[PDB]
């Protein structure tokens, strides 16, 4: 899957539909994977660099693959 | 959903009905989303600025949307 | 419900019946709410001041309401 | 349940069966309590001293009661 | 289960099939145990040494047993 954005997690958002948004690089993207919520907030808090890979690489686009570096 | 309040989490409260209350800005708001409890306590502990988004923007109002910065 | 004790968590204990005990101020109290276990351990580790609210405000009293500050 | 051993968690072992071995002081002890399992991991991650309470205080002994200090 | 690799977690990856991959030593290994995800990211974050035990000890192999040190 192509890299979409890489960078520290700028901010995150818990959404009303229970999905979870991250702003990384130039994009907000959201995931419907419950498991990723804790992981991504941890990554935000600790300032980890993450790479979000998705074919739907647009603002508001969906993702389910993350590399934590 | 419009922003309701933004600030550090002044305190949180675990309620007898197992809902979870946050005090942010000038409002106590509560959520019954279990996923949010650990996210909100982490945001409080680490001193994140959160924005609670809700249409019940008044004391005692319910919410299910949060930005963590 | 009335405040019972306020202070840092002195220690916590996971009990054989799967309830969870905290010591705050001069009182040892316990809760049967699963949700509170990780929250209370996190409060303890991070040095948060908690207020345990309960009408059973005595050693061995049960509680299900906590303010984390 | 009497004290068995007090110390920092030397290692934790998540087993195939999903049981959870912990080594504290010179004792390797197993527990089947999933929640207690994740509290121990948090304790080890953050450097907490714990007291494992059990009558079966030998390698391979079981427990279900811990004091997090 | 026999030892596969021992080392710090170099990076981790959340996969589209909801399994989680760790790079330790010269191996990428993945697990389907949800519970291990947070613990493995934590080990990565804190620089903990892990020992992954599996018979599938080869790049891309699966695992379900870990010792956190």
Curated annotation (Swiss-Prot), chains A, B, C, D, E:
Q: Where are the transmembrane segments?
A: none
Keywords attached to this Swiss-Prot or TrEMBL record, sorted alphabetically, are: Disulfide bond, Modulation of host virulence by virus, Secreted, Signal, Toxin, Viral exotoxin, Virulence
Location(s), subcellular: Secreted
Q: List the disulfide bonds.
A: 4-57
Record bears the keyword Disulfide bond: yes
Q: Which GO terms describe its cellular component?
A: extracellular region
Q: Name one GO molecular function term.
A: toxin activity
GO biological process: what's one of them? symbiont-mediated hemolysis of host erythrocyte
Please give the subunit comment from the record.
Shiga-like toxin contains a single subunit A and five copies of subunit B.
Tell me the domain comment: There are three Gb3-binding sites in each subunit B monomer, allowing for a tighter binding to the target cell. Binding sites 1 and 2 have higher binding affinities than site 3.
Q: Which family does it belong to?
A: Belongs to the stxB family.
Role:
The B subunit is responsible for the binding of the holotoxin to specific receptors on the target cell surface, such as globotriaosylceramide (Gb3) in human intestinal microvilli.
Q: What protein name is recorded for this chain?
A: Shiga-like toxin 1 subunit B
Q: Which organism was this protein described from?
A: Bacteriophage H30
Q: Which residues of the full protein are shown?
A: 21 to 89 of 89
């Amino acid at each position: 899957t192509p890299d979409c954005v890489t960078g520290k997690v700028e901010y995150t958002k818990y959404n009303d539909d229970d999905t979870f948004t991250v702003k990384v690089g130039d994009k907000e993207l959201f995931t419907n994977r419950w498991n990723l919520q804790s992981l991504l907030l941890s990554a935000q808090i600790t300032g980890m660099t993450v790479t979000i890979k998705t074919n739907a690489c647009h603002n508001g686009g969906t993702f389910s693959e993350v590399i934590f570096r």
